[PDB]
Amino acid sequence: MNHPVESVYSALTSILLPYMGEPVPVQRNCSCCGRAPSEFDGVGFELVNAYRERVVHCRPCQTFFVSAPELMGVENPKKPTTGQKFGMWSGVGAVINVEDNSSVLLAPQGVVNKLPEHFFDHVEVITATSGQHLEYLFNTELKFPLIYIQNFGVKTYELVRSLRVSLSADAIYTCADQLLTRQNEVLYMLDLKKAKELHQEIKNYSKKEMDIFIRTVTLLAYSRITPEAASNEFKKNNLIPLLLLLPTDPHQRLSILHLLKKV
DNA sequence: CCCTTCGGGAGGTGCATCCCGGTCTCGCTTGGCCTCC
Ligand SMILES: [Zn+2]
Known part of the structure; x- marks a missing residue:
């Protein structure tokens, strides 16, 4: 639940x-999300994947593998009878408001074209590419609290095991279909608050100073310029407060810079 | 058991290339289609 x-x-x-269709009583944990059957009320959907593996998917997990062309349009014309699947979308994200229980779908223009009219009636969709998710956010x-999926992708199991509620703008957890280990959440954690304050205070700096700051910080984060060189660049361009607002x-730093150069 | 020399003088110049030709990949899942059992 x-x-x-x-x-x-x-x-x-x-x-x-x-x-x-109706579920089936099961006696093993959902292989897709991995939680125990005790929170499925004993029901589940049996399935066989493209690799011929018997997998149980619970009610909220099985939806990522459902074929509903009459609702989700056709995903590949070579196979008309299998429409778009939530677990197979690549480049499509969404933002889900849990407390409101609403969703907004961030799909690119191609997917939006493939979607029928009836889809939009249930889910509000805004045309945005993979790079434009950050612009919307x-x-x-x-x-908040919200679930921000960045890439539905094709690895549905890793997607569901990477879902994490974003309790506030300080820490928005991106769910990019890559397994969200405790080692790699830094690459999937977005601090909209810090990026927002940095964007508010960046207005005080020239476009040339902006480019200089971004390039210097990017090179430093990639160890392509020595710290003394970056410090000289910041001091000469009066970029000290910006660095003070950057995370260590x-x-x-790279993630928030990528966000900044998108908005 | 002598007594070991002077110094002259020390380059001038050439000529220093052309051209190629910089790759595939793939890190996922699914169904359609092909033959196999
Ligand atoms: Zn599940």
Whole structure:
């Protein structure tokens, strides 16, 4: 019940409620999310994947493998009878407001074209490419707690095991279909608050000074310029407060810079 | 058991290339289609 996949299912993937059929009583944990059957009420959906493996998917997890062409359009014309699947979308993200239980889908223009009219009635979709997810997140007033999926991808198991509720703008957890180990959440953690304050205070600096700051910090985070050189560049360009507002972590620096150069 | 020399003088110049030709990949899942059992 109170797990990350359940919220995204209720808010976003409940649109294909008609297109699964009834569950089946199961006696083994859902291989996709991995949690225990005790929170499935003893029911589950059996399935066999493209690799011929018997896998049990619970109610909110099985929705990532449902074929609903009459709702989700056709994903590949070579196979008309299998429409877009939530677990197979690559480049498509979403933002799910758990407390409101609503969802907004960030799909590129191609996917939006492939989606039928009936899809938009249940889920509001805004055309945005993979790089434009950050633009929507920055510009639009997010409502927390929320689940921000960045790349539905094709590795549905890793996607569901990477879902994490973003309790506030200080730490928005991106779910990019890559298994969110404790080693790599720095690459999937976005601090919209720090990026927002840095963007607010960057207005005081020239465009040339901006380019200089971004390039210097990027090179430093990639160890392509010595720290003394970067310090000289910051001091000569009066970029000290900007560095003071940057995280010490170089990967977070790169992430927030990537966000900055998108907005 | 002598007594070992002087110094002259020390380059001038050439000529220093052309051209190629810089790769595939793939890190996922699924169904359609092919033959196999
Ligand atoms: Zn599950």
